[PDB]
């Protein structure tokens, strides 16, 4: 379930739109994403997040 951001899309908003809740849903996204947390949290327009299943 790979999604592409815009220049203002943010991580806790995105995995709330995908999953429906945020309990155990942000760090599971940061786990299966290489170098995602190193990038600045107001995202750039072209970075890809593969949201895993069962957060």
């Amino acid at each position: 379930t790979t999604c592409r951001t815009a220049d203002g899309d943010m991580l806790d908003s995105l995995c709330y739109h995908v999953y429906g809740h945020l309990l155990g849903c942000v760090e599971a996204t940061l786990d299966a994403n290489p170098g995602l947390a190193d990038e600045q949290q107001p995202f750039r327009a072209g970075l890809l997040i593969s949201f895993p299943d069962m957060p």
Binding site: D12, E27, L30, L36, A37
Partner: protein
């Protein structure tokens, strides 16, 4: 004779994170620090705007350390982080199809996947290096072709 990476135990530095167990600590470090002078735990209080930054930006820094700890381990690194493991062991990523196209759509330089680098970094030891024993003079004598 190499061991698979899927049977390794989990390391020490990689941690599961929680936003709550960082934020409930920041409540449990600030409420005792105020000595009862601050007692409005309603979210509209502008300290809980900021304690949800100091627990969110810390969780990003806790994840960057977990991202960097996976990047220095062979069983978890991927992307351009196995390139740094590959450059130390004189192993380069392959080219199945070449890089330069002749047509108007640019043909992508097809590299092998990072699941096959973990094959090649781990086979960089059991490799023909020098013809020391009787089993290595013959394997280094496979330059010709018409021969048994």
């Amino acid at each position: 004779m190499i061991i698979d990476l899927s049977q390794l135990p989990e390391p020490e530095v990689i941690e599961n994170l929680d936003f709550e167990t960082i934020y409930q600590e920041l409540l449990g470090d600030f409420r005792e620090a105020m000595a009862g002078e601050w007692t409005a735990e309603v979210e509209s209080d502008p300290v809980l705007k900021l304690l949800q930054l100091a627990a969110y930006r810390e969780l990003l820094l806790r994840a960057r350390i977990n991202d960097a700890a996976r990047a220095v381990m062979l069983a978890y690194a991927s992307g351009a982080d196995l390139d740094q493991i590959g450059a130390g062991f004189n192993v380069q990523r392959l080219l199945i199809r070449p890089a330069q196209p002749e047509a108007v759509p640019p043909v992508e330089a097809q590299y092998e996947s990072d699941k096959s680098l973990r094959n090649r970094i781990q086979l960089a030891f059991e490799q023909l290096s020098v013809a020391g024993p009787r089993n290595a003079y013959i394997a280094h004598a496979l330059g010709a072709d018409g021969r048994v």
